[PDB]
Design a protein around this ligand. Sequence first.
Ligand SMILES: [K+]
Lengths: 132, 1284
Amino acid sequence: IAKDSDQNKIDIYKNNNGLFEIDTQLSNSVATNNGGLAPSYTENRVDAWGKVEFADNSVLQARNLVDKTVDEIINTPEILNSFFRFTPAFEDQKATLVATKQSDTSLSVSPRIQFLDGNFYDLNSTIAGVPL
Amino acid sequence: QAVDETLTPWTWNNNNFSSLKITGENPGSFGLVRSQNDNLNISSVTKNSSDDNLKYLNAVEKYLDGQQNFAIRRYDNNGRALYDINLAKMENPSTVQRGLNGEPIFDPFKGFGLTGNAPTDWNEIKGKVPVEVVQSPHSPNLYFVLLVPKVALEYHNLNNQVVKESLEVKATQSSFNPTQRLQKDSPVKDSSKQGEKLSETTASSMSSGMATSTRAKALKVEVERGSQSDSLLKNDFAKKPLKHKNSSGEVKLEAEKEFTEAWKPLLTTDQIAREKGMGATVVSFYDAPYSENHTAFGLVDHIDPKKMVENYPPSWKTPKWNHHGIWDYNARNLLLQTTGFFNPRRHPEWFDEGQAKADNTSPGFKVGDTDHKKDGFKKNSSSPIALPFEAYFANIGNMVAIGNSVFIFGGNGHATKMFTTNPLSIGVFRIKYTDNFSKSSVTGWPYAVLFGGLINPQTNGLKDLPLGTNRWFEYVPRMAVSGVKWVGNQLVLAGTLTMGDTATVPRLKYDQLEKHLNLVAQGQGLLREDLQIFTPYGWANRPDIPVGAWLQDEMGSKFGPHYFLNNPDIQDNVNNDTVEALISSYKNTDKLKHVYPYRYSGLYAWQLFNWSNKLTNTPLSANFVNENSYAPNSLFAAILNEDLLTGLSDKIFYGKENEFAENEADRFNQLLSLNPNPNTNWARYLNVVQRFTTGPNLDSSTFDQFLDFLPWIGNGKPFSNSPSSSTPLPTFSNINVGVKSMITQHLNKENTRWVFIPNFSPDIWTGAGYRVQSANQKNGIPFEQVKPSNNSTPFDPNSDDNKVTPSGGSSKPTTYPALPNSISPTSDWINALTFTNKNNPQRNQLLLRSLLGTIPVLINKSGDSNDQFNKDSEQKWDKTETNEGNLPGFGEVNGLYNAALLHTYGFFGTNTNSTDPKIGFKADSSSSSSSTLVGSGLNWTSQDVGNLVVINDTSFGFQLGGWFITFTDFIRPRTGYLGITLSSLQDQTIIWADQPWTSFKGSYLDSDGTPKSLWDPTALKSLPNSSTTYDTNPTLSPSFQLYQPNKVKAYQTTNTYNKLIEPVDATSAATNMTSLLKLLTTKNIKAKLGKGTASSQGNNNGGGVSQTINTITTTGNISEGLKEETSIQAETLKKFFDSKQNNKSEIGIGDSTFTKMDGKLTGVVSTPLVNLINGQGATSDSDTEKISFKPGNQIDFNRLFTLPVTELFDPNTMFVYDQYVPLLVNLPSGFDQASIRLKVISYSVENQTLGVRLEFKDPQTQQFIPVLNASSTGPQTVFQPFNQ
Ligand SMILES: [K+]
């Protein structure tokens, strides 16, 4: 964190085989917080949170998962990793889907994604008790 | 497309590559092959006198495109050929098609998607031959290959009037004489300019001192800038009161009056960069063994010379200049030497005009004008360092891959080497990939900046080697490279390396060149030898006295108080009253420095200890650098930062911190070190080396004991001589040479009783050629060897020039109380750096050159009629005190002893031959005498380095000429282990060949757990001519040199070695020694030794396989020969070796075992299970015959495919579950069902199709392998519900 003139700016330096170099795209990704405590999420962009594309609903019929119940699927995290394709912003950045039962017949999923600090963030994350 | 059997496998001389082992998902081999056909008459491509080389080289490539074929076929894991890949001829060439994320589109049974169009530059890549192949460490099915013009193979088969030696053979019509080529005449005081000499200090500051003397004062040197636009106000380093001789014109380096048909490159660096067909190329490619679309290309990159040459350091624009500048430039030009640090008179291989610029003129600085204040300013350069054709292909070969990048460390230089021309790897190229392998980039850098972090902590061998550097990259390391490989987790480099020049750190007095012809010829490029030679009687007091100071005693009548001859006994005594007159007053300033009225002196070790580019404990420290080596003179292996080699930026940026001083006022107050500027990055590259090694893990004279322990390959006898009155003496170590005496009388006469030897008597062996008053008075000598200047009486002790007058009026003579007992080049004194001659550089130089067996010997006498020297009645091994011991005392190789080396070679006596050859050296008291160096009879050289091979997680080795060497302990050192093992070849038909390395066919790791190599005695060829019509005395050949006459005065009949031996004018001496001039050519040595023809006997053919000695954890343990508790460590190691002279294999030293084969040996191809010779040796794989996939008529589809294919395998790892294996694969009765399983390779659930590959436990190894016989589609198959 530095000031060029008088406002604070966030640069991210990435270690490359023992030598740190600025990453200008990741710097812009992290610095785009829109006044929030953490970097924005954009659906169509590899941002600080990588990029998550969900499967169409039509995957259930094609793979015969309609014969599985919500509780089965919900306790089978390898099935529900097959509900999205993830593009990491930095090598070995990881992401999983947290599942929530919505009805007898349906669930929702929401990504849990590592940031630069090796930690996973999701909808309920806090720092100092403050929801992000 | 399909296999053609008419192409056969081969090994390239420059990298020794022949095959790559593929690893990971689909194992097998790639290997080089070529057409078998004879009668390749390249000389039919006629060369005219009126045109340049380029159209000739293109006509040779067009001819070779008709006369030969070359290809890179794939083989399976047992060595069965799969597809041909003749890159000049293959059908429908294409790059691979990509998705929007850069990934290649692929499906294993179909193969890759092809775009239907060839890569860029396909119209000029199709003429090139592939010469090395490697695989990506992280990306599947992705490979890299290096390609060159076919002249980079055929270079020695091109016609001899264009592919010339760097020196001419001549017609010898007046008879041969090696002195006729040498510029020799010494400089003199200028008859019209005597007065411009340095001024004597008229009054000297007190500095609270007290003592006084009658002697003349120190001389002032001053430099300051003034106000003038192109001149200084003072510049005393640029004075020039000496000038060159006139002898039918002026003597100087002036290439156009010496080189009437000057040697030049095949192509210049600016030609090879722009003529895109003549530059080397790397390409990426994709491969799969059983697909329909089995192979296609990725991307193409030029290994462009400008991407190396524009990354040379700023000083390489001016190789005729160095950071010491004007005084050093003048002192070198006055001695007729190379100026700067890299000029073409020694090193023509890196210059676009070759020998035609072999001169000291116009060094990029203003010099030689009418005023010393006008000289010393930066200007335009006359010749920068380049990368011409010969050096370029020596910088090609030895690949490795790391992350998204691949490298080229350069070859051994056998692509482009000639008998007087030494191209080498000078650095590393890198090729890097970007946008997920959608794009690429290329670069390279010299070893001079990459090795800049070397320090004494980074080696377990000897310390202070000539490998150091500073803020200017004027030290230029280059290598013959053995390879780069992974030793377990560690990336490792191996080869042979150039030190700094150790032969010219001591420097001559200005007038005496006519009695020192070899020492000037070794600097002139006329003698291309890197060994240190004993010459002390003609050296000056220091290497670094400026040329304006020298002319202070032209008569010698004061023994030159500021500058005189290096004799060790007559040094000025500083005592303690003396210092106030000679140093303890002359304070320097920001414009004033002094030359002292003090007689400095010391022998070869003290010279190197002060002015060699030695290593130290911190980087960039070495302020002194001399010159760079002719050829590799060190072993070298190292551990690299594979991460930093991946992390460093493509472009190196230097700056003003690496520039020489713009004018001499900035040279007088010259900054030794600087921080990197904000835009520059050169300091990042210094740290790519973690650790290095250079020889045995031994310290002091113990290392000379190892040098004496190893056998000479010409006769199998160790240089220690102990395994059989009047017995012969060893050459390298001092143990049992001369006699023992206590050092208690030497120098300070103190500490010796308790802080030198573990024992009450301070015993040291006095060595060969020593001084004593009597056999009883065996300890020390007094100052009795006083010496005259001419006939003008002795050194005059108690005289007022050799006295001082401190307060109280007491006075004493300024000379030694007592002195050491020997000055000979074998000397090994612990207490006396100024009298010891052995040094750690020489120990490493001798290690390498004694392995290759090519240390020279000094001769007076040949086997010819009335010229003979005898084994008996003419040599007295028991009487080293007199001339009958035959110690030369001049012109001898440093550290060793000549008569012992002659005995070990067997040049006199029946040691090497069935009758006495009678060749040798004799010291006589009756007359003046003449001598020369000659070769050993062997033709090996330090560029003869082969494949690096890795044996396990810590042990690795390589071929080096007639030896295989192993560096077993370098990754994990231990106490009491020497760290090296060695295996020697035995075959006399190879060892006595004329170009011996051409018989080596490659070296490889073998699956029984040993390294092995191939040889063929039918592969040798004749020299470039058969003498044809005249007596060829100078036969240009790999061990030949233009050694000069040495002429020497008569020896004293008794007390022979009490003073240094005196040389005399050698400029006419050749007429007395014509037998020795004929003996310079190795074939004439071999003829007199009985080795020159069919009298060598043994096998007429007998090509085949060679293997290193057996090894165990005890091998190389020498813990009883290491450490001390009674004596000196070399002597207890000598006792430990003497009982083991017949049992060397437990020391790790011995001969390689050998087996013969029928027919020719051309090369090998390798797999993780087997090695194939000429491509033969494959087998039925009998342990795997009973394993097979079920055929389509044996599948009950409803049993397999009522469930979707989605859950037949674990999603975490893609192996199929065990229950489906016997449903898809047949297996024998009693089989272990846990030993085999199926891996999914592609599938689609909407088609219910599953594609698989099978893997099985290897019966020989703790690892899985594919089962290649499992189907008509190999180890791969598909299964689906009838919808195929
Ligand atoms: K995103």
